């Protein structure tokens, strides 16, 4: 599930060794996607629990809203889920024009 919460535990585990603080624009993105993957676990942690139990309809009622969020991942990094996006040198590249009237539209 986690794509930006993993690799958050790696670059921050490497930048301490290398005597680097990351630049300040970069830190506002690691908190943004680092506080967007929690809106992927805490959707999957309830629905998949509610499927073993055996309820059908809250599995389909929330993943159809989940699709509005993978368009972000594809727009910023490289792919559907597995993105080599956080680097040890901060963020790979800047997120393009958009994604600020989209997230505010989403949230």
């Amino acid at each position: 599930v986690s794509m930006m919460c993993n690799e958050q535990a790696y670059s921050l585990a490497v930048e301490k060794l290398l005597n680097i603080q990351p630049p300040p624009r970069a830190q506002w993105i690691r908190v943004l996607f680092g506080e967007i993957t929690r809106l992927l676990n805490h959707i999957m942690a309830v629905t998949t629990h509610a499927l073993d139990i055996g309820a059908m309809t809250p599995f389909f009622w929330m993943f159809e809203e989940r699709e509005k969020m993978f368009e972000f991942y594809e727009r910023v990094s490289g792919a559907r889920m597995h993105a080599a996006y956080v680097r040890p040198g901060g963020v790979h590249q800047d997120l393009p024009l958009g994604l600020m009237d989209d997230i505010y539209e989403f949230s």
Binding site: D94, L95, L97, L99, M100, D101, Y104, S107
Partner: protein
């Protein structure tokens, strides 16, 4: 120079959690239940007693003939 952060336009949406759309509570319920229930019993005694009147009418034709 073409970076993101907009000047204005924000909400937010709530973190609130409420939808108390009640709902006819507190002794208003059990009141539509009892009165409509006795209404169904009130519909009785005007049909079963009425069919009982026809029931003696049905047995009447049997007893009048058969000598």
């Amino acid at each position: 120079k073409q970076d993101m952060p907009p000047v204005g336009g924000y909400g937010p949406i709530d973190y609130k959690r409420n939808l108390p759309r009640r709902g006819l509570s507190g002794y208003s319920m059990f009141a539509v239940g009892i009165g409509a229930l006795l209404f169904g019993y009130w519909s009785m005694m005007k049909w079963n007693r009425e069919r009982r009147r026809l029931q003696i009418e049905d047995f009447e034709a049997r007893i009048a003939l058969m000598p």
